[PDB]
């Protein structure tokens, strides 16, 4: 607690980070990220997941999910975990460091203003999102104040941006979380 | 780094100690003076020239302290603010610093936050942010604040986080300059 910043990973996320995995097509990468969303929701976390891949080979470097409530840490969004775990594994703060393959972050949702800045500092060269900011806000979450034309912001820093990839499935998982997110017991959740 | 079951960012000894030693600093300038000591300690421990600490806003009881651990920590998210807010939340056992019955918390920072930390401050539940060095001062030694929204301060204030800036600005700048020179 008090000698380190320590956010524990639920087993399914340990498993995801331990098992070698190559997913070539963007839809394959996002399909896998959306499996983590569903698993995270069943392990007490928020409806968001993200993974860092080698952009050109499809090799999964590290995955993260939203652990804000179970990990008691408002910074524990999926993207922060995924980026930080990828950095720890490749032993550098800078995923663009000399000698590293170009890295891509694939995220179940467009980033909040915090994760937006994290993406910029991280060194990934591309960002691929499923759910749009409006989908996320629809179930009550807040993206916070991003700068005007944040996507342009990214591209002007050499970070390519794609969004809407498997958005339908991503929206369906947001709604499942929402519909199970009350206090009144509903066997079915 | 080592462990595959956690995101684990180790803190250097002065910062472990800052996090486990009792300190009550009533005046704003006393809080900021303490954060500036951390800045200089962190530089000597191979970190960036930034520190922050979360205090109880009224009493000035220090809850937790963070510094920039990006390079030695291998973690671009390890800015001073992210560590200080996260360690405070850990110690108070909640992801939300304005959870009912917790005292109002305040983030005292050696410089204005970058766009990432600006987001982190919004989600954290702190009700006050107090900065030393300005954005300009920070760019003037080659750190990037990133594309923050126009009127980031009004953004915080509209969400119930009061903002004070420039507090011991000159002292904090002298440490920025020293960092940049060495
Ligand atoms: C809005 N929001 C809250 N938590 C989030 C997370 O972990 N990822 C993304 N993309 N958005 C989030
Ligand atoms: Zn986020
Ligand atoms: Zn920052």
Describe this structure in words.
Chain B: This is Cytidine and deoxycytidylate deaminase zinc-binding region. Chain B: It comes from Nitrosomonas europaea (strain ATCC 19718 / CIP 103999 / KCTC 2705 / NBRC 14298). Chain B: Residues 26-144 form the CMP/dCMP-type deaminase domain. Chain B: Cytidine binds at residues 50, 68, 144-145. The structure is a homodimer. Chain A has 189 residues and is α/β, with parallel strands linked by helices. Chain A has a single domain (9-181), classed as Cytidine Deaminase, domain 2, CATH 3.40.140.10. In chain A, 39% of the residues lie in helices and 17% in strands. In chain A, strands 3-2-4-5-6 form a 5-stranded mixed β-sheet. In chain A, helix 2 packs parallel to helix 7 (167-179) and helix 3 runs parallel beside helix 4 (113-122). The interface between A and B is large, with 50 and 50 residues. Residues 46, 48, 66, 77-79, 107, 109, 111-112, 115, 136, 141, 143 of chain A line the site of 9-methylguanine.
Topology:
Two copies of one chain form a homodimer.
Chain A: E1 4-8, H1 11-18, H2 26-42, E2 49-54, E3 60-65, H3 78-89, E4 103-109, H4 113-122, E5 126-131, H5 133-138, H6 150-156, E6 160-162, H7 167-179
Parallel strand pairs in A: 4-5, 5-6
Antiparallel strand pairs in A: 2-3, 2-4
Helix pairs in contact in A: 2-7, 3-4
The site of 9-methylguanine (9MG) has 14 residues of chain A, from helix 3 and strand 4.
GO molecular function (chain A): hydrolase activity; zinc ion binding
Binding site for cytidine (chain A): 48, 66, 142-143
Protein name (chain A): Cytidine and deoxycytidylate deaminase zinc-binding region
């Amino acid at each position: 607690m008090n000698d380190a910043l320590h956010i524990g990973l639920p087993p399914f996320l340990v498993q995801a980070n331990n098992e070698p995995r190559v997913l070539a097509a963007p839809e394959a990468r996002m399909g896998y990220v959306l499996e983590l969303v569903r698993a995270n929701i069943a392990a007490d976390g928020g409806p968001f997941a993200a993974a860092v891949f080698e952009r050109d080979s499809g090799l999964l470097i590290a995955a993260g999910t939203n652990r804000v409530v179970p990990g008691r840490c408002s910074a524990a969004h999926a993207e922060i975990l995924a980026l930080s775990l990828a950095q720890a594994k490749l032993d550098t703060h800078d995923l663009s460091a000399d000698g590293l393959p170009a890295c891509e972050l694939v995220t179940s949702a467009e980033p909040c203003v915090m994760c937006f800045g994290a993406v910029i500092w991280s060194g990934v060269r591309s960002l691929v999102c499923a759910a749009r900011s409006d989908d996320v806000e629809a179930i009550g979450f807040d993206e916070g104040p991003r700068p005007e034309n944040w996507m342009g912001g990214l591209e002007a820093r050499g970070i390519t941006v794609t969004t809407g990839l498997l958005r339908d499935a991503a929206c369906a998982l947001l709604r499942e979380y929402n519909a199970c997110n009350g206090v009144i017991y509903n066997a079915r959740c």
